[model samples]
Target: GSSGSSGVTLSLTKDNFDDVVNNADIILVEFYAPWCGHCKKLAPEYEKAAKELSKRSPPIPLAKVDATEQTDLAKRFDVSGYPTLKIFRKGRPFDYNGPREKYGIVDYMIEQSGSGPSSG
Candidate 1:
């Protein structure tokens, strides 16, 4: 099932962000700015992916870092754009630049983590 706690919450500080990234086996972290239209648009899709992925093998936990608020975390992760999805495994991040749809995001996570059907 989906990993960790449910619901999409903004991870506003560098320490919490680091905790999430470092603790989870797979972390889907979105670097977003509240005022950005793209970030707003992708919020629902990102949440959906989080919910779905939480139920699958090697479930990926989801977290969001407000780029405008947590500038240090954003800078540390090299997040130069809004709505940037970074998938972290073992405290290292993998940039996910594919479509922001739920299926696309889920598939990408599965592929990246080698936890999908093909990986059997």
Candidate 2:
């Protein structure tokens, strides 16, 4: 959590990137630049989804990487835009290409956990 609050999104760094993602069953990561307008626009939506997802049965993790500073991590994750989203379901990588809204993300994650298209 940031600013002493219990944030839904996890602030991931290069030091803990592999450890956090490699050990999880389902994980969602966002690579964003702090100064980008699109990234700023997506931040709240991302947080909202995280908050909602945490109440689910499995409690999939929602994390973030600052692409502006974490260039190596962003490169490894294939982030080219200001706000790039990636999903790891069962330790497999899948680039997210869905609506940037709370409901869509939650539904997408649920679909991924189930028998959706075999993606990352």
Candidate 3:
């Protein structure tokens, strides 16, 4: 069996945004402001979930956009808060309304994948 190189959460910019989202079958993106306290609080949890997700059968990558600077990308998704998360499946996005903890993020994305039988 071959193991693919593990992926890490990525920081997104206008230049790289299209490439990453268009390529991944599924990806989680967070739009956050650097000066926001809530965003700072969520960073560690986000990293933990990113690490865990990398171990899944079809890894779901996590990415972040500096909403303060990446205005265009943030505007595209209509981000009005300190931290906004969205799930992109095959280049389309859906709002993420789940918990912000490590395991919760992992479990929720796993459910979203629908890669198995119809029983959950």
Using lDDT as the measure, which candidate wins?
A: 3
Candidate 1 per-residue lDDT over residues 1-120, each given as its tens digit: 225643744353575767656877767788878799977778888878877888877776677778888888788878888888787776888777687898898888877877445532
Q: Which pairs clash in the backbone of model 1?
A: 1-54, 1-55, 2-54, 2-55
User: Candidate 2's residue-wise lDDT over 1-120, tens digit each?
Assistant: 124547889887787777777888889988888789987878988888988889886676698789988898888877788789999755677888787787888877777776445654
TM-scores for all candidates: the values are 0.82, 0.86, 0.87
Cα miss at 98, model 1 (Å)?
2.0
Q: How high is the lDDT of residue 29 in model 1?
A: 82
lDDT of candidate 2? Answer: 0.80
- Per-prediction tally of clashes: 4, 2, 0
lDDT, residue 14, model 2: 80
Model 3 lDDT tens row, 40-120: 878888888998998887777898789888898888898888689999876899999888888998888888888467653
The better candidate by TM-score, 1 or 3, is: 3
Q: Give the Cα RMSD of candidate 2.
A: 3.3
Off by over 4 Å in 2: 1-5, 115-120
Provide the RMSD of all predictions against the true structure, rounded to 1 decimal: 4.3, 3.3, 5.0
